[PDB]
From TrEMBL:
Domain Thioredoxin: 5-131
Example of a GO MF term: disulfide oxidoreductase activity
Protein name: Thiol:disulfide interchange protein
Subcellular location: Periplasm
Residue pairs linked by disulfide bridges in the UniProt entry: C38-C41
Gene Ontology, cellular component aspect: periplasmic space
Tree of life domain: Bacteria
Chief location category: periplasm
Organism annotation: Legionella pneumophila subsp. pneumophila (strain Philadelphia 1 / ATCC 33152 / DSM 7513)
Range of the intact protein held here: 33 to 216 of 217
Length: 188
């Protein structure tokens, strides 16, 4: 009578499951591969946060920054640092705006340190994060390895419950993207 209308191969695809250690208070898990440097990541970020808020316990959104372009390595470190400080909800829109709207590339370690300090972060925490943290470097790399495992080569992209992927290109619009994500969080 009625037929499924979330179409595998068009709206989403299945991926090979990665070997994960996911905390169950992070389930259903939505992983967004993104960068501050991506205009499409920027466009959808605030609606995505709103959608995530409206999902409440129905979803746990985790972001994974990617390195595709000059300066994106530092943008990734900025994400990990802000997250560590529990400041990524505050800093995500600030960083997006600086890079995308003010065309401030924040292209040096120094410029990033200063930017973080201007927004209330301790100078040494930010300096040491950018200049001497193998821990943060390893997270940047591990995010990129994950992205490759999922056969993702464009952002924004989403992997839901370590099994289904979608992106704005597949969805075709922000509204369809969130309909797709609402569907996927419930699968398998």
């Amino acid at each position: 009578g009625s037929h499924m209308q979330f179409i595998e191969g068009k709206d989403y695809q299945t991926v090979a499951s990665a070997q994960l250690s996911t905390n169950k208070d992070k389930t259903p898990l939505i992983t967004e591969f993104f960068s501050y440097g991506c205009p499409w990541c920027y466009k959808i970020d605030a609606p995505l946060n709103d959608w995530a808020t409206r999902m409440g316990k129905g979803a746990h959104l985790e972001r994974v920054p990617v390195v595709f372009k000059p300066n994106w390595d530092l943008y990734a470190k900025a994400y990990y640092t802000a997250k560590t400080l529990a400041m990524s909800d505050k800093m995500n829109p600030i960083l997006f705006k600086a890079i995308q709207e003010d065309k401030n590339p924040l292209a040096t370690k120094q410029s990033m340190v200063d930017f973080f300090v201007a927004h209330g972060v301790d100078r040494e925490i930010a300096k040491s994060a950018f200049e001497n943290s193998p821990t943060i470097d390893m997270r940047v790399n591990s995010g990129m390895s994950l992205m490759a495992h999922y056969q993702i080569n464009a952002v924004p992209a989403f992997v839901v419950n370590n099994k289904y992927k979608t992106d704005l290109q597949m969805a075709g619009s922000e509204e369809r993207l969130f309909e797709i994500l609402n569907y996927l969080v419930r699968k398998s």
